[PDB]
Amino acid sequence: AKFTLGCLPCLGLSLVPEIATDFYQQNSNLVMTLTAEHTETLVKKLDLREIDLALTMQPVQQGDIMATLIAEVPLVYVDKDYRQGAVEIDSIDQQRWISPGLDSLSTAIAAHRVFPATGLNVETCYMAMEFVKRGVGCCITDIFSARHSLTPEMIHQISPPMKIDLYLLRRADASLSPVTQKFVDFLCKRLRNELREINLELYP
Amino acid sequence: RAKFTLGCLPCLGLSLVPEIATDFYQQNSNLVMTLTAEHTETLVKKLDLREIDLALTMQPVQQGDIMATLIAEVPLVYVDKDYRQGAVEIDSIDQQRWISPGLDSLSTAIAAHRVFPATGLNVETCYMAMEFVKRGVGCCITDIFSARHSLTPEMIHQISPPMKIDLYLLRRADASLSPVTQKFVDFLCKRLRNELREINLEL
Ligand SMILES: O=C(O)Cc1c[nH]c2ccccc12
Ligand SMILES: O=C(O)Cc1c[nH]c2ccccc12
Ligand SMILES: [Mg+2]
Ligand SMILES: [Mg+2]
């Protein structure tokens, strides 16, 4: 059994290594490879057969890549500047906005508000969180990246609540092994379970 | 009216590049900064495609249209939850617990001293590997930046003989940087060098 999973950086910071660790400890006689890459690179690696599976927040219809919507992930407002509870997107100060590069994210936000161009554009979630921590500005990010890098006081639900879709991509012309099928099922169950606990913690 | 885009390796974006860019951004108004962290191959592709202006890597570029400024040498360290002591000889490392970092500049530096056989676990992003190490799953050799960022000092060990990898700032050979972007390059290179001079001392 041998498979390679690529994920977005927000998922590689902690959740995927936790899930992989639990599976790897329960199932030996396998070779697992893991990597974190932005979406465009994940799709390219699936098309070149450099990875078998990708976790993204955007569907694709390229080639024989099939994207399966597996969960909905909260989007949260993040800032060092104190906020009470939930944040309406129209209350955000566009002068402090850090524009996120994740197209899916920027596209989701843009459905609710078009932020003008700013002096700071950050395309990788954990680098944005560092700028938030140093007080340089504010952002909307996925909860996985916020939860990893920030204290709870810096994380705020949106009003109304905002989510982004989480997808599992694999090639359809390609065929999975049983162990890889078992891993995909385990991975999906643990991701859904984590989002359940996250919902509890986000409740204001 | 001044704009630049810098890509860096993940180990550098976890903390050091945001810190340095924060200091510059603030010293320079009327600036648009774009920052991204990507693996070496992607950085060089983006540089070639003109999607980024500058890339920080740990690998020079072969003959082509890329120029490469040698910033400093980066210590490599052994990381292990279970190892309690001091410097580790490469050949004393337990190959059954080895987490391979895939095929990258780091792996090439290790292979010049020891060729690890194939392992059950291959982890090609530094912070993901640090998570497996913190959970006790295996051991690795990594750059000092990713180690310091995710691990407690107890889990970080020097190698014997000491290993290093070179840090480069890459740019297109056929494109002239704007005056503010050159100023940022000088600032970045100096701060990175001095951060590593400080680290090399503490070791
Ligand atoms: O880097 C990623 O995982 C994509 C991404 C997720 N949240 C973000 C916030 C700001 C910029 C990029 C991202
Ligand atoms: O992911 C990166 O910055 C490259 C890299 C630096 N140290 C590492 C350890 C294990 C796997 C990859 C890396
Ligand atoms: Mg975390
Ligand atoms: Mg990354």
Numbering used by the authors:
A (entry chain A): 44 to 247
B (entry chain B): 43 to 245
The authors write:
AdmX is a pathway-specific LTTR that acts as a transcriptional activator of the expression of the gene cluster responsible for the biosynthesis of the hybrid nonribosomal peptide/polyketide antibiotic andrimid. AdmX recognizes indole-3-acetic acid (IAA), a key auxin phytohormone essential for plant growth and development (30–32), with an affinity that is about 60 times lower than that of its biosynthetic intermediate indole-3-pyruvic acid (IPA). However, it was only IAA, and not IPA, that modulated andrimid production in S. plymuthica A153 (29). AdmX-LBD exhibits the classical fold observed for the LBDs of LTTRs, which consists of two α/β subdomains, RD-I and RD-II, composed of αβα sandwiches with a Rossmann-like topology.
AdmX-LBD crystals were obtained in the presence of IAA and IPA, and the structures were determined to resolutions of 1.81 Å and 2.25 Å in the P21212 and P212121 space groups, respectively. In contrast to other members of the LTTR family, where effectors are generally accommodated in the hinge region between the RD-I and RD-II subdomains, both IAA and IPA, bound to the RD-II subdomain. The indole moiety of IAA and IPA establishes hydrogen bonds with Thr231 and Asp232 through the nitrogen present in the pyrrole ring, but it is also coordinated by diverse hydrophobic interactions with a number of nonpolar and negatively charged amino acids (Pro190, Gly191, Leu192, Leu195, Val212, and Glu213). The acetic and pyruvic acid groups of IAA and IPA, respectively, form hydrogen bonds with Cys100 and Cys215 involving the carboxylate and ketone groups. Although both auxins establish similar interactions with key residues, a stronger hydrogen bond network was determined for IPA, which is indicative of the higher binding affinity determined for this auxin. Instead, a higher number of water bridges and hydrophobic interactions were observed for IAA. First, the analysis of the secondary elements of AdmX-LBD with IAA and IPA revealed the absence in the IPA structure of the small β-strand located in the vicinity of the auxin binding region (residues 189 to 191). In contrast, a short α10-helix (residues 183 to 186) was formed in the structure of AdmX-LBD in complex with IAA. Second, the long β-strand 7 (residues 244 to 262) in AdmX-LBD with IAA bound is broken into two shorter β-strands (residues 244 to 249 and 252 to 262) in the presence of IPA. The total number of interactions (e.g., hydrogen bonds and salt bridges) is much lower in the IAA than in the IPA structure, 14 versus 32, respectively, indicating a more tightly packed dimer in the presence of IPA, which also suggests a reduction in the flexibility of the dimer.
